Every structure is written in structure tokens, then in C-alpha cells.
């Protein structure tokens, strides 16, 4: 605390405008997670999604043009409004179409995370994405 | 013209029609309860209790509704040793309406 003088002391925590007794410092909260534990958690989440009918498998998911209207119409035709589309190679058209829609998120096969899978109601992953995830999870 | 009867271990003197407070006796609201334990019957010429628990008559009562009493605060704490222990109590009770006394 700016200032000095010990005529007790004015910088004591009890004194007004004094320093904090246990002032916090910039720290890190990252917690280590075992790779096998993480893979097991992902497998458990995928199994739970499968058993709850919240998982939809599609042979191919493509959009002719990078227009969000077409993607929205396609999702509406399949009774989907809040989904996590998963594919292999991240097509530019699909990503551009889905960027604007807040309720729709698209990520590559390797970008799947537990929070993303759990939060979104339904998860759509293409057959190629299915194979990639199966290989990744061992 | 009244009657003295024992219900919850404490004798009550009740007149006809007037409701009286009793302990929470487990009986349905609709059903009526007969208090065969009549310790005194009072009339113009009262009949005395020659034998305890006179069986010459019975008392009918109707439980209008059950309920809990008034909130009471109890402080078991004492000695002023700077501790606080406050507990709430709400005793159960039943108001029973007694109509008709058998002599």
C-alpha cells in the first residue's frame, strides 16, 4: 500500500484503506487429467448419448453453397435446431453456414470435448467421423 | 350442568356444546369419539362417584380438526457463558366439541 510511517501502523488490515490480509496473487487452476481417464470419460459420454437416442448418424452432411439459409433449412427438415455436427475434413461451406447460427456448432472429429458433447442436446457425426473417433479412442 | 372426564391424563370439566382442548389423540376428523372415562356428571342434583371411573354414562365428542399449537421458544442455555441455543416447539392439539352428556 502506497505510503509509510509507523508512529501503530496505518497499513494494517484492520485500519481503513489498509492492505488485504490474504491478498490473492495470479495463479493457475489447471488440473491434470490422465489420458486413459479422459478417453474413458469420452467413451462413457458417447455410450450415454447412444443409449438416450440423442446420437444421430448420417452417411454424409454437405451443403451445396456457403449459405446459412440452406443449412438452416436442412436442419429444419431433420427436426434439428440445437445440434453438434461432427465430420472429418472441415468443409469451408458447412463451417461458414454454421458460424452464424448460435444453436448450431460444427467441429472436426479431433475437436470433440466432453462439455461440448454434453451441453448440446443431439450430436450428429458422419460415418467418417465415426471411424475417426473410434480409432482415436482406441 | 357439566361433566368432568379424563382424556390425556389431565382432567377436564366440559359443558355441553362448548369445545374443549385435548391432546392429539389419533382419530379421524369425521369419526366421533366416546370418552367412557367420566369422572363426574353434574346436573341439578349431581350423581356422586361411588366407584372410580363411573360407567353410568359416556361422553360424545367430535374432532372438528387437528392442528399444531403456538410457537414457543426454549433456551436451554444458561450460565451466561456467551452461547446461544434457541429451539422452537409447537405442541399438537385437538379441539373436540362435546354435545350431550349421559347421566
Amino acid at each position: 500500500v502506497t505510503g509509510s510511517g509507523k508512529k501503530g501502523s496505518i497499513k494494517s488490515p484492520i485500519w481503513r484503506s489498509g492492505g488485504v490480509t490474504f491478498a490473492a496473487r495470479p495463479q493457475d487452476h489447471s488440473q491434470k487429467v490422465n489420458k486413459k481417464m479422459y478417453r474413458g470419460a469420452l467413451k462413457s459420454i458417447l455410450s450415454e448419448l447412444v443409449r438416450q437416442d440423442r446420437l444421430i448418424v448420417v452417411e454424409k452432411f454437405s451443403v451445396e453453397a456457403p449459405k446459412t439459409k440452406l443449412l438452416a433449412q436442412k436442419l429444419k427438415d431433420m427436426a434439428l435446431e440445437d445440434v453438434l455436427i461432427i465430420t472429418g475434413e472441415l468443409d469451408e461451406n458447412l463451417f461458414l453456414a454454421a458460424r452464424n447460427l448460435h444453436k448450431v456448432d460444427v467441429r472436426d472429429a479431433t475437436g470433440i470435448d466432453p462439455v461440448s458433447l454434453i451441453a448440446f442436446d443431439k450430436v450428429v457425426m458422419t460415418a467418417d467421423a465415426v471411424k475417426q473417433v473410434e480409432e482415436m479412442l482406441a | 350442568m357439566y361433566a368432568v372426564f379424563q382424556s390425556g391424563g389431565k382432567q377436564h370439566r366440559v359443558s355441553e356444546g362448548q369445545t374443549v382442548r385435548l391432546e392429539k389423540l389419533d382419530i379421524a376428523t369425521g369419526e366421533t369419539v366416546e370418552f367412557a372415562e367420566v369422572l363426574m356428571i353434574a346436573n341439578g342434583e349431581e350423581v356422586k362417584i361411588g366407584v372410580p371411573f363411573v360407567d353410568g354414562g359416556v361422553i360424545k365428542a367430535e374432532v372438528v380438526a387437528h392442528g399444531r399449537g403456538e410457537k414457543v421458544k426454549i433456551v436451554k442455555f444458561r450460565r451466561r457463558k456467551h452461547y446461544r441455543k434457541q429451539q422452537g416447539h409447537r405442541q399438537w392439539f385437538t379441539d373436540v366439541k362435546i354435545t350431550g352428556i349421559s347421566a
Binding site: 462439455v115 454434453i118 451441453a119 | 452461547y83 446461544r84
Partner: peptide, 26 residues
């Protein structure tokens, strides 16, 4: 379904914050 997730029984302990009142022990 983030709401449903809860820790396993006994895994997490709240801990004791001593010096806070008399009903908490210290």
C-alpha cells in the same frame, strides 16, 4: 445434461472453517 452430473459420494469434503461461530466447532 450438465445439471445431472454430481460427484461420487465421499469424494468431495466441504472442510472445516474454524473460527466462524460456535455451532461449527472451533
Amino acid at each position: 445434461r450438465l445439471n445431472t452430473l454430481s460427484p461420487a459420494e465421499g469424494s468431495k469434503k466441504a472442510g472445516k472453517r474454524l473460527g466462524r461461530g460456535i455451532g461449527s466447532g472451533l
